[PDB]
Amino acid sequence: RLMNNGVGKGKTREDHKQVSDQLYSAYANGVDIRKLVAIIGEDALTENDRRYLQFADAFERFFINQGQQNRSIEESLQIAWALLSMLPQGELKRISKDHIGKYYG
Amino acid sequence: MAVIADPETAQGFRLAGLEGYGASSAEEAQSLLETLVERGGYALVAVDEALLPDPERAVERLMRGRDLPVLLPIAGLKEAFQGHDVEGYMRELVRKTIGFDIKL
Amino acid sequence: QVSPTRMNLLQRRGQLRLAQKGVDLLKKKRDALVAEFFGLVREAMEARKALDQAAKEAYAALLLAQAFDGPEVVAGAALGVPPLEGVEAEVENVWGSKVPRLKATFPDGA
Amino acid sequence: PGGDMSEPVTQSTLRIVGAFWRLDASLAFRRHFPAINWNGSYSLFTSALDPWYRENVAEDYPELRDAISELLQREAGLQEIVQLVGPDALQDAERLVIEVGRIIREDFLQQNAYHEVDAYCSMKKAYGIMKMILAFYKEAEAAIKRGVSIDEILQLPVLERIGRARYVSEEEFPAYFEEAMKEIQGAFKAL
Amino acid sequence: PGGDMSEPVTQSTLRIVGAFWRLDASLAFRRHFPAINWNGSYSLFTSALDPWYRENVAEDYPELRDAISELLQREAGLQEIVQLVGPDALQDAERLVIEVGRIIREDFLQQNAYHEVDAYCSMKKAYGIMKMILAFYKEAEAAIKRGVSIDEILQLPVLERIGRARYVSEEEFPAYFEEAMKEIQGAFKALA
């Protein structure tokens, strides 16, 4: 409940809250898209929700599953952008245009 | 493959090879439809539009066996020289499906 | 009923949580089936309209063919044609439900 | 007392014990012994018994144990869907996961303590049974993504070999394990 | 503490109080400030405040207040087949009910409280916004009865006018409301 006053301009980086909310929404529907895929399959999807399933299944293996290695805020944010680059360009809706145009890929 | 469409123009369907029957009375056509769903006439029955709107309800009553005899509303010829009202037919099919008057 | 202890309260909270997830799961399934229904309805009306155009072709040809010639010649011809049998219905097993799709045999060129 | 583990005794035991083992009763009505509930039992000593396992049992033994636990977690995840929708309206890969989890719980977890063989089961036999089931699962999922029916997978004479692989003795076991691995490649060679 | 509304504190409070203004977290997640849900909120002071309204706001004020509550009840009524069927795939009347409910939500109820002149809003200004939206609906409905299609009436320069009518200083609003009413009646007489 105390992240708005913690991250931002001159605190860590400017994209921090938007990366946070975008990762949260993308993992939020990447969870229950596996519940949908359980009864339908991998061909009767869209391309979009299939790509969300791949985002969730790589999110919970590169971002959360850290191990005991040491991650700064910079390498954690660039792993966050490398995971968000699995999503299609322009679907990153909760981010303003400059951060997308500067840190994508 | 059988039809119940017309008195004489079902001879063109017989001329296609595929068998059929025509009576121009609703109940003898439905009775030959009954012996045609008992003795299954090779899985397709094409029924006239402006004689039977829904052929399927009486047939699923008198045969709860499976839908291997498929039942279609096939077009009458005379009304075929008017216009099909494809839109209104899909309206009534979607309203037969979900009840709603929603229009795709 | 069930004899209430502190265990069964959490077991019923777990059963409630599973049913509250299952309602949203089946709403997502219904949304996917709505998407596929509006997929198929325009293809069905397209094939219906093509059937109507070929119907106009075939009915005009049948009227003109029984017209310029007699009715008896096409009558004996139509009662001479082989019955084109063996048309049957094979599998489309999808949603765990076999729907019968239809294909013919067509003795036509002979 | 009440069959409920919210007691003041149990909640004061399970904060100081490691390796807490809930026995349920619904796996004990059907005679499935030992009735270790897997959804709520834990063991914390798995991160200091890794070098002992890697020297005295095999080399890939922690990864194989983790494969078992991950597959049982996916089974107990999909038990939601199989209790809600039904055993059908499920894909072939997830039906594979449910059936492989069921043959794990019937051929690796279940153990009757009155039969002469299969009371004392030293861990060479347990490593053998887990390597059988994971080789079956990996080649079965490769076959099912190539694409065959699941009913021509689940009627082999090789999962009956896995099911009887815990009634064979410890004494002649590694030759039987070699024969089981040879048949486990030679039963998916044919498909 | 649990976010549930059956504890005896919330229960005793809702027995005692005369107005309940249900804030929700979902509307702020859909970026709707103030985040006050209108489908769970309730007040009991309307019937007592009707004669003050008729002596100080305007004469016909409770009737179109009831009209706005009727529109925001029909929108959330048919919202389920909005989600099931599609946005445009309803009929010509119900989609217009959707769009007038949407202009209500994003023009009347939504209020940027940090802004210079959007924060305060008196009764005359709220009555003006309410009469603009209701005149739009009550003429667009007969307009879609007479001769128009549903897209020709939406994209029109009274929509930006109504949508930015809340950004008017309180003295300027009498010199703006009448012109907006004249131009919405003229733009509905012309072709719509």
Side-chain angles (χ1 to χ4, degrees), chain B residues 98 100-104, chain E residues 81 84-85 89-91:
Chain B
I98 60 171
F100 293 153
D101 198 358
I102 52 99
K103 294 180 178 174
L104 202 284
Chain E
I81 66 169
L84 187 146
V85 177
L90 276 307
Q91 302 301 320

Side-chain angles (χ1 to χ4, degrees), chain A residues 55-90:
Chain A
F55 175 73
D57 204 3
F59 182 80
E60 66 182 3
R61 197 263 310 277
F62 290 109
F63 188 74
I64 296 172
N65 188 3
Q66 182 179 1
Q68 290 182 356
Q69 63 186 355
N70 197 4
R71 287 182 179 177
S72 299
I73 195 63
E74 289 85 4
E75 290 182 353
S76 292
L77 283 176
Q78 74 181 1
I79 292 168
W81 281 106
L83 266 295
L84 287 174
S85 295
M86 292 174 69
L87 295 178
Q89 174 54 252

Side-chain angles (χ1 to χ4, degrees), chain E residues 61-111:
Chain E
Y61 178 74
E63 287 85 5
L64 78 166
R65 188 260 307 279
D66 293 330
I68 294 298
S69 178
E70 186 184 1
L71 290 171
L72 288 174
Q73 190 175 5
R74 283 201 295 267
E75 179 186 3
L78 51 85
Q79 188 183 4
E80 180 64 33
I81 66 169
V82 171
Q83 182 178 0
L84 187 146
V85 177
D88 57 354
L90 276 307
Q91 302 301 320
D92 293 332
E94 294 178 355
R95 183 178 178 269
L96 201 149
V97 174
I98 295 163
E99 189 67 31
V100 174
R102 183 258 182 188
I103 192 176
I104 285 170
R105 289 184 289 109
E106 294 185 359
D107 176 67
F108 185 69
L109 299 180
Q110 184 175 0
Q111 178 173 357

Side-chain angles (χ1 to χ4, degrees), chain E residues 150-183:
Chain E
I150 196 165
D151 292 331
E152 291 181 354
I153 48 178
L154 296 181
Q155 289 86 20
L156 203 151
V158 302
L159 265 287
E160 298 178 356
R161 184 171 298 275
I162 291 168
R164 275 75 176 174
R166 66 181 178 177
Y167 292 156
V168 175
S169 69
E170 187 67 30
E171 185 179 1
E172 189 181 0
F173 191 79
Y176 180 80
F177 174 72
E178 293 176 353
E179 289 181 353
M181 190 63 71
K182 290 177 188 293
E183 293 184 359

Side-chain angles (χ1 to χ4, degrees), chain A residues 34-35 37-42, chain D residues 78 81 85 89-91 94:
Chain A
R34 290 182 290 174
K35 294 178 177 64
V37 162
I39 54 176
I40 291 172
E42 294 177 352
Chain D
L78 297 177
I81 310 301
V85 174
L90 288 170
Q91 295 295 317
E94 293 183 353

